[PDB]
Each structure stands twice: as structure tokens, then as C-alpha cells.
Symmetry: D4
Subunit: 173 residues, 8 copies
């Protein structure tokens, strides 16, 4: 879970292109950091503040070599229809980051974010280039407003990998 590799997955996905494909978490090993996020459902009457805020800050994730992956229990076909629905009609519009489909609910379950065997709870999961979990943000920290905070944690992660931790001055073995 937090000891070694993040739970692996092989899922169906709608790319920025609106073309379908398969995405495995291992595809990003030694290539990109992954910001995997969960949301409950497509097409609801609760505004999709996290998908939109994250997509609005897509270039900030790309500059930091981070692959954004949005995940819900909906099918890839539902994801595509929600992208073909404009924001003015309750849709997400043509977002440019990938939406993965957790139709069997196994992904949500492996990340311990599945609510009453039905929908995923809101969660932000940062995974490093080796496939190791660095953070899990939930509840009042898993909001669209949290984008600025996620990017600061990515900068801290990237800074920590480069320089390591610091020792208290007066401490000695």
C-alpha cells in the first residue's frame, strides 16, 4: 500500500484526443510522476470542480513531468459522452488529460477509496517515477481548491529526491 509499489492496474481510458485506449500504472515507471485522482460519478448535479481545476492547471503538471489520471467507476463510453457535453449543459468539455474507467470498481477498492461497493470517494494520490505512493489527500483536502497545494507537494517531492532530508545542527550519533 505505502510500502513499495502503489496498487497496479490495467484500465480502459479516454485520452485527451477523445480516442480510446488502455492505461497501466506501470506505463509511467521511469517516465512520469502520476497524480491519480478519484471522483464518484460522471453526469451528476455536483459541479466537477476537481477535474476542471486540474485540467486548467495541466501545463503546471506537464512542466513538472506529472501525468494526470482521473478515475471513476463509470465506463469509458460514459466518460466520452461527458466530454462531448459542454460545461454549460453539465458536462466537462474537452479536457486534455486522461480519464480512466474503473468499471469493475477494483481500482477504487485497491486504493481503499470505494464507498459502499458503489462509487469512489474523492482522493488525490501522488505516485513517483518508481511507482511508490508519496501522498494521499482526502475529504476537505480532496477539493478542486487543493490544486495549488498538490503542486507545492510535487515541488517538495522533487526537491526531496534531489537533496534528501536535513539533520538538526547540534545532533550527533
Amino acid at each position: 500500500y505505502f510500502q513499495g509499489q502503489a496498487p497496479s492496474f490495467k484500465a480502459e481510458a479516454v485520452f485527451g484526443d477523445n480516442t480510446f485506449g488502455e492505461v497501466s500504472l506501470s506505463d509511467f515507471i521511469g517516465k512520469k510522476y502520476v497524480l491519480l485522482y478519484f471522483y464518484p460519478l460522471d453526469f451528476t448535479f455536483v459541479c466537477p470542480s476537481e477535474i476542471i481545476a486540474l485540467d486548467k492547471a495541466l501545463d503546471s503538471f506537464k512542466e513538472r513531468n506529472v501525468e494526470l489520471l482521473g478515475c471513476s467507476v463509470d465506463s469509458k463510453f460514459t466518460h466520452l459522452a461527458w466530454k462531448k457535453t459542454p460545461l454549460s449543459q453539465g458536462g466537462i468539455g474537452n479536457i486534455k488529460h486522461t480519464l480512466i474507467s474503473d468499471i469493475s470498481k477494483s481500482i477504487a477498492r485497491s486504493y481503499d477509496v470505494l464507498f459502499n461497493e458503489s462509487v469512489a470517494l474523492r482522493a488525490f494520490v501522488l505516485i513517483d517515477k518508481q511507482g511508490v505512493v508519496q501522498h494521499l489527500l482526502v475529504n476537505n483536502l480532496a477539493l478542486g481548491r487543493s490544486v495549488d497545494e498538490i503542486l507545492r507537494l510535487i515541488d517538495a517531492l522533487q526537491h526531496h529526491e534531489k537533496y534528501g532530508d536535513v539533520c538538526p545542527a547540534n545532533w550527533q550519533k
Copy 2:
């Protein structure tokens, strides 16, 4: 785990006073936010960068109404002896925040941070005034260097509770 209450505990503890007592996570409900952190062991030759950095920033946690709780699998007696050992001799000195004792390893286990049924992995767990988990920081984000980041997440949490999430401008039900 991330759905409702954080795993409950009733543990032995060494207070800032160097006096012993009992601490329950529920003692802080409707009183304080809790920053529960784990570290593997007392008395090792790896500098205690997280205990010291957090204690150096104690006043920043108090101003934000956050109770700092340090936890390892060591006994309260070992915690006390490590506080009575100065930094120059490999100790932590008289830190002013509480060190809880997870002698049965049940706390570490309930937070899924127990490594090979022996020691806890490094972790920072932020819990709100209702006893609900807001974040879990691990691996390269569970360093002493992370203090600035923890406080920014507390400020975001506190800001999010006050104002809620924001909706994309052009989105409509």
C-alpha cells in the same frame, strides 16, 4: 480508514512535562486538529530530523490549534530516556510535544504503517476536529523538511472548512 473516523487508540505517553499519562485520539475531538506522526525507533544512529523539525515549529502548530503526537513502537520508558539524552549524545532533548508509545504495535497496524511486524514506517497523518483523516504523507514526503508543507496543508484544510470548494464559472447543472 478514510471513510469517517481515523482508527481510534488509547496509548501510554510521555508529555512535554516528562510526566507519564494516557492519550486517546478521541480526547481531541471538538478541541484540536491532530498531526499524528510515526517514526521507526528511538536511540538509532539516523538523526531524528522529523521530531526535531516538528518541535522547532511547535508554536506554528499551537497558533493553528494543532496537537502534535509522535509515535513509535518503543515504550514510554524508552521515550523518557531518549528525552533525558541530549542532542549532542544522540538524544532528542526536552521536546515539548507528546510522544505516544505503541508497545503492542496495534496503532502502526491500524494506520497501515507497520513494517515487517517490527517498526512503524515514517508517516504524517492530519486529523480534523471531528477525528477524520485529511491527509497521509509518506516516503519522500514524510521527511523533517516537510514541516513547511504540513503547515500549508493545515492552512488549506482550515480555509476549506470555512469557505468550501469553488465551482467552475461557466459550469451549470
Copy 3:
């Protein structure tokens, strides 16, 4: 399963009105016969020949006191968006019979029609006014083309309840 009551359910639903509600199979006891049907997913590129054929023959089901219930693993929100998508754009249009939502997949599972813990297989289940299964049609009999056959089975069911079975002429106890 086929001995007494059909598996019970309490599900979310999109009515003919495009209004949301809850539907329990027991709501129809002593009121209506139920033709519960399953299909895999909303929004796919396989034409929805069964939803459309059944809705086109809705008045034939109403005259025979049969409540049509369509079911897939999609949410009620997805069902509503697929109804708000016209046939020319790959939608189902404003169908006048109820679409129930099996978001937890428990309904499909109870009827033994859940394929690889993901989607429901095509199935037509006829249930009497006492809540007892009369038929299960699957595979090459669970097609849109089958509507004429379903109605003939309803007429046979209704005729059998009224008159009972017939005995061979020359047979004697």
C-alpha cells in the same frame, strides 16, 4: 431463484418523466407483472435494439398490465444523460418506461447475469404479480427482435393462470 420470490431489489431509477426516484421489485406485487431486462452499458457504439424495440411496444405491455424495467450497471445520472441524447447522436431519446440503476452490481449478481464483475449480460426476466419468475431469456433469445416472443409468453402466462394445465385424454390415476 426459481423457487418462490425473484431476488428482491431497491434501486435508483429514471422514470418516463426524466424525474428520479426509487424502485423496489415488491412495489409491483399484486399490481403488475414485471418484465425486468438487463443490458451491459449506456453510451456504447452497439445500437440499443432491446430498449428501443421494447419502448416501441410499450402500449402492448401496458394493455397486458406489464411494467417494463430496464437495468444496467450505470448510474441514474448516466441513464438521464443517455435519454437527453437523441437517437441520431447515439442516445436512446425520451423512452417512456423506467431505467433502473445497478451501480453496486448487486441486482445483476442476484439474477446471475453479471459478466466478469463488470457489466450485465443481456437477459429478459418475466415476473408474475406474486413476484415469481416465469422465464429467463438469454443469448440469442435476448435480442430486440424477441419482443413478439416475450408478448406471446405473457399471453401464455396469463392464459395458464386463468385455466391451468390440460390432461392427456386417455390418462387415468
Copy 4:
């Protein structure tokens, strides 16, 4: 069950000849469609309306390349004695289709038609040339009167295999 092959069996049987043999459901693969039917017991005082009606329509099943298989928990020896009992004395007479014997009750159990670990419930199971279930008719649809309906479903099955389903006119991907 309804996903791939119908439950397989290897049973003792009384043929039209009144000779004994073994019948496996797989014997009919790529040869015949199978109409497997269950009834509770031989020699009862309830007239055998389903065995007799089906045998009276045997030529209609043969013209449609359908093998009729009657099944109860009785032995092949009991089946033979019931065939050697004329209709006027409470028997079935010399029927020309096969009666299989489910002495261990394993067949009934695999088709989920075993009542209180004793006798099979009335059921009509249509199986295609590949050994896949197409329908299950039970309760008020598992009557002798249902013969006309079974044959119409066979005609629909055979028609559906030849031509496939039909798409709604105005629907487009």
C-alpha cells in the same frame, strides 16, 4: 450457467427403443439443439401433461433438429417400468424420446431446479448446437400447454442465429 456452456452431465437413460444407455449433453454438440426438461417424479397421481404433450409434438422437434430429453430423479429402471405401464393405468406408455435418470440429483442441482434436496421442479431448458442456454421456462410457463410456445422460441432462436438482431432505423453511433 448462462455464460458459456450449460452444466455438463453424463447420465443413464431409457431410449425410445426401451433399451438402456448413457447420454452426455456434449453428444449433441454440432448435431442437435437440446430441449432438456425436468419433472418431479414418475408414477405419481398428477397426470404427466408435459411428457405426453412433448412426445405428441415429437415430429415438430425432429423437423427443427431438436433432441428432447426428459429428466427426473428416478432411476432408469423406474423410467422403463413407467413406459411399460399404459396411460389407462397411470403410466406414460411407449414414448419415443429419451428419459434420462438423475439418480444422484446432481443434474437438477446444476440447473438450480432441485427442490428440498428431493425432486426436480418443472423446467424447460433450450440449449443450442454449441451447448449454450437460450431459455429457461419455469412455474406457470413450465406446463404441458407450453409446447406451442417452446416451438415458437425454437423458431425465433433459429431465425436469430441466421439473421442477427435488427437496429432501430434512426439510431446512429
Copy 5:
């Protein structure tokens, strides 16, 4: 099993009268000794040497206050048809002792005489007026020829209950 009461049962039965009823092993407590016997099947081509030999010696069992109970996995309806079939046509004729029906196979199973979850093995079980097993005869001792031996064991049982065991002359505590 052999410690206290013989396995209890409540079964369907064909009496000497050819009338149907229910028989419980407990009906005979404080009334009769019971000679419960098992055989595999009715209507086979193996002569029913045990049913016939026992019925031919019925008066010898009645004089010794023994109730004869024949048991197989066949239904009461099959038992009745086999009694209505004369010996010359492979039947048992109008036997005057009761044939019980073990349709669920639970009786055979409780006496550990059920062969491959299908038919009962040949067995002679003598039960006393308190419902306690006195003997089990099987294999080459469970033959029709064994009648003379069964009656000698009943005489020994009845003699042993009246007088108890005998002590060796020269033995002393």
C-alpha cells in the same frame, strides 16, 4: 451411531394395505423392535431376494414383536407401482410389511449406507424397543439367505435383555 439412539427419521411410506403414510422410527419406541433394511433400487433385473425372504418370514418377526421396515432411495409412488407389479413380471407383489421412501437419501446417509450419493448398500439394522442399534449386517451377511440368522440374533437379543451376560466361573474381583 452405536452410542444411544439410532439415527432418527420421518419418512413417506407404502403400508401392507397399499395406502400411503408417514413413518418415524420413534413411533416404535416402547412398542416394537425394528428390523430396518436397505436395498439399492426398485424395478431392477437383480431379483429382490431380501424383500421376499423377509416377507415370507413376516409371521416369525410378528411373533417376536419386530416391525420390518424396507428402505430404498425410491419414492413411495415407485414402491406402490413395484407392489402392483407381480413377481412373474419383475415386481415384489403385495408384500405385507412397510416400504419406506428415502427420496432425499438422508436416511441411507445417516446409517452410512449411501453408495456414491446415489443408492443405498444392502444392510440389516436391528433396533431395540428403546431405539438403540443392536447389529448391523452388511455385504455377504446382507443377503436374503440371512433371514434364519437375523431371527437367531433377535432371539439372542431378547434372551440377553431378560437374563444379562454370564460370568466366568473361576473369575473374582
Copy 6:
């Protein structure tokens, strides 16, 4: 149990010689019939009527090619001491048939004659030259007085193996 081979055993034993050895039930296959008998304990104040009666009739068992095996949960050492105790002092004297020792209670358990995980119940088990159980005599038929009856069953067994069962005169397939 009664289907094929009697439960196998390899036990410690006191022979007629008062010498110790090992006895396996399989040693007698194709050589002797075995009359295995159980009794609760050595050295009690209940006279050993079955050991003594059987030993007094030893020559009758030898003439019929039957190996007598007495069994209790006592050790071979206890068996030997009870044989070295004369009948006048509560012993069995120098009996000439084998006493096997069921120190682990596994033999009694395999024959379903173990009472409250402590001692064996009285039982007479006749086993043929192929190692198959022919009878089990218990309770009021497992007395010392039963010797005459055991020998009559051996004569019937031996007669049945030679000539088989007899068919009723007027019966025909």
C-alpha cells in the same frame, strides 16, 4: 467403513506366547477371517466375560480359519500384566489369542466405538479374507453370551461366499 476395506491399523500386541509384537489388519488378507472385538479396560471389577468366552471357544474359531483379535485402549504392558494375573485375582490368565493395544485410541475411533474420547465400547467386528466388514454387533449383542451367535454368522458368511444368495422361485426379470 462398510464400503470396501475395514479401517486399517498397525498396533502393538501381546500374543498367546506372552511375547510382544506388531499386528496389522492387512497381515490377515488372503489368510484368515478376522474377529476383531473391543472392550473398555483391563483390570476393572466387571468380569471379562467376552475375552474369556471367546478364548474358551478358540478352537471353534481356528477350525473356521478365524483370527481372534481383542482390543482396548490399554498398553501392551498392561495387557501382559493382566494375563500374568490369574482369574481368581481379577485377571484374564494366559489366554491364547492376541490382545492388541490401542494406546492412541485411533483404532476405536476408526471403528466408531470410542466412548467420550476415553474407552472403547463393546463391539464384535467380523472381517473377511479380503479385509471387508461383514458385521458389527453392539450393545446387548456384544456380550460374552454372543459366542454361539458369532460362530453361526461365520458359518453363514462362509456358506454365502461358497453358494451366493437364492432367488424367489416365481420371480422373473
Copy 7:
């Protein structure tokens, strides 16, 4: 096991009197210390060095208020016969301390001294007046020669209860 009460038992026993009775370990609570010892079997050809050495030192146990209890898997009847066998004939003679009988092997099992579900291993178990285990002596310390050592441990136990442990001179909290 070693935390609170020693495993409880209610066993059959042969007293010094050669009279039979029942012994419960709880009978000695607040009355006597108990030296419970195990040995494999009565009547063997291995001299009973532990029973004899302990009985020869009986008065040393009585002066120290210790109840000696000898235990093996043999019956009380075997124990009595071994006491009625003199030492010159391989017996134990009239020992004056109690021999308990572990016929079900449950006592040996509860003390973890049961060897291959057959006999108890040699063991000396000292139990205090509150029913708490103070020592377990096994293998090369569970010999008849060990009597002097057992009594020294009883003297140490009794001395430790009276005066408690001693603290190192220069040690301070």
C-alpha cells in the same frame, strides 16, 4: 499456561489408601502447593525411578506442605494393579501419594507433555497455593535423581514468597 492459573483438571485417582476417588487441581487452592509429575506408562520394563524416589522423599514434601500427584495416561484400575504388584515383580508397591489417571489424555495435552497422542513425556510441574505454575522440569532434569533439586526449588519458592526479590545495591530509579 504460565500466565495465571495452571490448566485445570478433574481426574480419577488411586489414593495412598488404594481407595478410588476424584481429584481436582483446585481442591488444593489455599491449602497445598502441588508437585504434579508425568510419566509415560505403568507396567513397563523401564524402572519407575521417579515415582519411587518421590515416594521415598514423601515426608520431605509433607513438611513443606506439598501434595505429590503422579500422572500417566493409564486408568485408575491399572494404577491400582501396579501398586498391588511388588517392586521385585516390576511393580511400584504400596506408594503413599496419589496417582491420577489421564485416560482421555486431556491433562497431558493441557500441560503440552503429550507425546504422539499416546503417552505423556516425563515432566515435573510445581504449582503454588494460588494454582500458578512456578516451574516445569523436563528431559534430563525430569529424572528420579532430580528430587533433591525439586525440594531446593520448593525452598526457594517458599523463601521468595516470604521475602521477595533483592535489588542491586548501587541501582537507583
Copy 8:
């Protein structure tokens, strides 16, 4: 447990040198006898009467070829800090025998001395050169005062291995 080898272990350890290493119980096979002892915790306010008494008698164990091993659930790092704390400040000082670390609590558990999945109970375990348990001393016999008694048991063990047990004079097979 007491049948063959004492539970094996591979543990971290602080040697007399104050250097760290690994200790396996098997390292001492065919070399030394082992006196493995357990105590609950380092750094408590209960004086360490057993560690100190045993270390004060170290030369008596060395002369008898006995390796002293002290064990608690504390880490090797805590053990080292307690040795670097003088007796006057509540420490153990520079003891010259090994302290093993049972950080996972698996050793305590294998010896059945783990109290409430937290700390080990006081116990003295003597193990021979073949790795076989000879004694377990607990409760009021597991005190610092017990050193004189432990050494007398070692002398008895060593004497018993050399000369074996003694037979009662008048006893004969």
C-alpha cells in the same frame, strides 16, 4: 516445545563489547549450554535484579560452559543506551553478557512468555548443547534471587548427562 528442539531464533544483539551483531540459538549447538532469560522492558523504574544478579555471577556460568542470553521486546539501540546509562541513573551499566532484541515479539511468543501482545514475562530457560529445553522457571522462581538455584540445576543437568538416572535397589523387570 519440550519435545526436541527449543524454538529457533535469529535476532539482533548487543554484545559485551557494546558492538552489534546477530545471534541464532543454533550458533551454540555443540558448543554451549544456553540460559535464555526474558524480562519485560528496559529503562523502567523496577530495578533490573535479574540482569544484574546473572551478570554478577557470569564467571560461574562460563566455568560451566553456559552462554547467558538476556531478551526483551526492546530494540538493540535501546539495549545499548541502557548499558550506556549507569546503575546510579537507572541503567544496567556495562554488563558483559549478550542482550538480544525481540523487536517483532516472535521470540517471546515462541516461548509462550508474551504478555498481552506487548512485553515478555519473566522466565529462565535452560537449553542443552543439542538445543533441547531442560527447564523453564517462571513467576516467583523467575527472580534475580534464583541465580544460586539456576546454577544448581545446571550442575544437576551436567551430572545427569554424565551418569544417567538411578534405579531403585529392590526393583526388577
